Design a protein around this motif. Structure first.
Motif, mmCIF file in Angstrom:
data_model
loop_
_atom_site.group_PDB
_atom_site.id
_atom_site.type_symbol
_atom_site.label_atom_id
_atom_site.label_comp_id
_atom_site.label_asym_id
_atom_site.label_seq_id
_atom_site.Cartn_x
_atom_site.Cartn_y
_atom_site.Cartn_z
ATOM 1 N N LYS A 213 2.795 15.948 -42.009
ATOM 2 C CA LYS A 213 2.566 14.583 -41.531
ATOM 3 C C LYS A 213 2.366 13.672 -42.748
ATOM 4 N N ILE A 214 3.288 12.754 -42.953
ATOM 5 C CA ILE A 214 3.238 11.892 -44.134
ATOM 6 C C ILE A 214 2.271 10.734 -43.898
ATOM 7 N N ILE A 215 1.375 10.526 -44.857
ATOM 8 C CA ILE A 215 0.325 9.513 -44.784
ATOM 9 C C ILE A 215 0.749 8.398 -45.728
ATOM 10 N N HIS A 216 1.227 7.310 -45.132
ATOM 11 C CA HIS A 216 1.728 6.154 -45.876
ATOM 12 C C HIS A 216 0.557 5.311 -46.370
ATOM 13 N N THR A 217 0.689 4.731 -47.566
ATOM 14 C CA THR A 217 -0.423 3.990 -48.161
ATOM 15 C C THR A 217 -0.931 2.847 -47.285
ATOM 16 N N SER A 218 -0.108 2.381 -46.346
ATOM 17 C CA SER A 218 -0.495 1.270 -45.478
ATOM 18 C C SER A 218 -1.689 1.630 -44.601
ATOM 19 N N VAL A 219 -1.885 2.920 -44.288
ATOM 20 C CA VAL A 219 -3.023 3.307 -43.462
ATOM 21 C C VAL A 219 -4.354 2.964 -44.134
ATOM 22 N N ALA B 21 -3.471 14.618 -32.487
ATOM 23 C CA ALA B 21 -2.254 14.061 -31.893
ATOM 24 C C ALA B 21 -1.109 15.076 -31.894
ATOM 25 N N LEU B 22 -0.958 15.816 -32.982
ATOM 26 C CA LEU B 22 0.049 16.892 -33.024
ATOM 27 C C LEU B 22 -0.162 17.914 -31.904
ATOM 28 N N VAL B 23 -1.406 18.400 -31.737
ATOM 29 C CA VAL B 23 -1.682 19.351 -30.664
ATOM 30 C C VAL B 23 -1.300 18.752 -29.326
ATOM 31 N N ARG B 24 -1.762 17.521 -29.041
ATOM 32 C CA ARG B 24 -1.392 16.888 -27.771
ATOM 33 C C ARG B 24 0.116 16.781 -27.596
ATOM 34 N N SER B 25 0.854 16.568 -28.686
ATOM 35 C CA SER B 25 2.307 16.419 -28.581
ATOM 36 C C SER B 25 3.008 17.739 -28.241
ATOM 37 N N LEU B 26 2.362 18.908 -28.477
ATOM 38 C CA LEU B 26 3.019 20.200 -28.276
ATOM 39 C C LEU B 26 2.869 20.663 -26.826
ATOM 40 N N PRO B 27 3.886 21.306 -26.283
ATOM 41 C CA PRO B 27 3.742 21.921 -24.966
ATOM 42 C C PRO B 27 2.579 22.897 -24.957
ATOM 43 N N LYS B 28 2.016 23.099 -23.758
ATOM 44 C CA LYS B 28 0.785 23.890 -23.619
ATOM 45 C C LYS B 28 0.945 25.259 -24.247
#
Lengths: 237, 300
Positions: A60-66, A87-94
């Motif tokens: 997961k790339i963390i852009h300096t804008s964050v 968020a990654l976990v939520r995005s994955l199927p169960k």
């Protein structure tokens, strides 16, 4: 509980687990201001989320804008890491969601715990192992995609290339950690070993060179020697 | 001024009433305690000379009825009971006073200690933490576990304190994970004060009752509850000014009253060092910080 030398083979059983390393999330150069003061400039970072059994890397790339207009950034970085992992976990199927997440740094436990409150059956674990995942940005293709990013972005890799067609996860993870330990202890030398032979190439869809089985043995030996030397130099033994 | 008579004292026991305590010898002619100040809760407690384990006692308010103590030789402990016959009860008390077999609640008139320890404690709230609704008084002992302790076994015998947990959905709004974990103001003021306790007085009442149970019976789960309720306030950035001032006074008399030899188990190093020195409210507990340093600087 905490992961260590004793329960090390648990990494390669069939319970889905992920390592999370936050070392490279918040990255700065330190420089002098016109008035002589010291200031930091952030560069792009990344969360290193890795399935040690399959090699699947969720970069997961963390852009300096964050960071823009934020205070206590080193503290914020841990919560952003935990936000993004959740968020990654939520995005994955169960059936792909992990049963455990092992954080490489203990300071990540509370932020990840709080972000995972919706997943009470996912265990958040520390580790006693000294894992070399901070050297991930010594892998050229990973460093390149992080630095070139102009926005937040998830990039997916298999950190083992095709090794698992021929070796087990246990051995694949041992190879990976040896390579990363060497890049960490003396990047210049480590990288020399990997490329000294112009005839062994990196496939476009790979991270590491296409060594035969025999050439990997020579490589692994060269990487061990490198690590040992640095150590006597470090400590004078 | 009210009286709690004792039928007898068949076994050697140290009896406490509030912060006072007397040694009573087996079958010594003890027949109760008089001149108990009307207007506050009270607690009478016991520790048998042979079993220095299981301190136990009864919370009561003399305005809610006539109460007395009687030893039960089957269950092996001093039981509190209610006498419904008003006449029968003044007769017992007046005869026992006439024969002068009662200790006087020994209150110095300069002393507001008990008031200060029980300012917000109300019998009706105690009886919701200790559910036994056929008695007007409440039994507590060394070993009773809290509802929270249980969740991690007999519920009739539980201390039903309000559960506080800093890593819970209750404590943490979705979307304010980092904000709410670092600044518990929304958990303190919206969830706990406005939502559950209704007002700060009920909050302070539970805090004080938890402390007293920890102090008088070494009830460890009460000690956890007292620390949790302090930490929730001190870890909130936005606390009403009246609460902070009252908190400083509450904690001051609690620390003042603790036996000096008990600071090791009753006091949680991490909570106190964080409250007094690292928390949002580090600078709002001047009296409490001053007495802690001069009395238990080791802990700090």
């Amino acid at each position: 509980g905490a992961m260590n030398s004793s329960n090390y083979a648990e990494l390669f059983n069939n319970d889905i687990k992920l390592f999370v390393d936050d070392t490279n999330v918040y990255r700065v150069t330190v420089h002098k201001t016109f008035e002589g003061n010291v200031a930091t400039k952030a560069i792009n970072g990344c969360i290193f989320t890795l399935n040690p059994k399959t090699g699947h890397l969720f970069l997961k790339i963390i852009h300096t804008s964050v960071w823009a207009g934020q205070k206590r950034l080193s503290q914020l970085a841990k919560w952003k890491t935990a936000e993004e992992v959740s968020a990654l976990v939520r995005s994955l199927p169960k059936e792909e969601q992990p049963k455990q997440i092992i954080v490489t740094r203990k300071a990540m436990l509370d932020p990840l715990e709080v972000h995972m409150l919706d997943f009470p059956n996912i265990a958040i674990r520390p580790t006693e192992l000294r894992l070399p995942f901070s050297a991930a940005m010594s892998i050229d293709k990973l460093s390149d995609v992080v630095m070139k990013a102009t926005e937040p972005q998830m990039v997916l890799f298999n950190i083992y290339d095709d090794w698992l067609d021929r070796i087990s996860s246990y051995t694949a993870f041992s190879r990976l950690t040896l390579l990363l330990r060497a890049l960490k202890t003396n990047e210049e030398s480590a990288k020399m070993i990997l490329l000294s032979d112009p005839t062994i190439t990196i496939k476009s869809y790979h991270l590491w060179p296409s060594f035969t089985d025999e050439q990997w043995i020579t490589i692994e030996s060269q990487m061990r020697d490198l690590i040992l030397t640095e150590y006597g130099r470090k400590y004078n033994v | 001024m009210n009286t709690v008579p004792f039928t007898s004292a068949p076994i050697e026991v140290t009896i406490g009433i509030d912060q006072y305590s007397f040694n009573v010898k087996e079958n010594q002619p003890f027949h109760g305690i008089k001149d108990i100040p009307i207007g506050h809760v009270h607690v009478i407690h016991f520790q048998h000379a042979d079993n220095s384990s299981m301190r136990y006692g009864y919370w009561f308010d003399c305005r809610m009825g006539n109460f007395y103590i009687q030893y039960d030789p089957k269950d092996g402990l001093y039981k509190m009971m209610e006498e419904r016959d008003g006449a029968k009860f003044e007769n017992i008390v007046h005869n026992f006073k006439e024969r002068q077999m009662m200790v006087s609640y020994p209150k110095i008139d300069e002393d507001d200690t008990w008031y200060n320890l029980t300012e917000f404690v109300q019998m009706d709230k105690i009886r919701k933490i200790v559910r036994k609704d056929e008695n007007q008084f409440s039994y507590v002992d060394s070993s009773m576990t809290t509802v929270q302790e249980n969740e991690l076994s007999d519920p009739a015998h539980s201390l039903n304190y309000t559960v506080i947990n800093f890593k819970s959905r209750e404590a943490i709004r979705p979307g304010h994970e980092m904000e709410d974990f670092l600044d518990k103001s929304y958990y303190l003021n919206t969830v706990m004060l406005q939502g559950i306790f209704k007002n700060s007085s009920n909050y302070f009442g539970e805090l004080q009752f938890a402390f007293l149970n920890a102090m008088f019976f070494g009830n460890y789960g009460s000690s956890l509850q007292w620390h949790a309720m302090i930490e929730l306030i001190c870890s909130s950035a936005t606390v009403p000014k009246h609460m902070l001032d009252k908190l400083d006074e509450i904690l001051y008399y609690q620390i003042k009253t603790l036996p000096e030899q008990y600071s090791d188990i009753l006091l949680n190093e991490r909570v106190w060092n964080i409250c007094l020195y690292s928390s949002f409210q580090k600078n709002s507990l001047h009296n409490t910080e001053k007495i802690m340093e001069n009395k238990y600087p080791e802990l700090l």
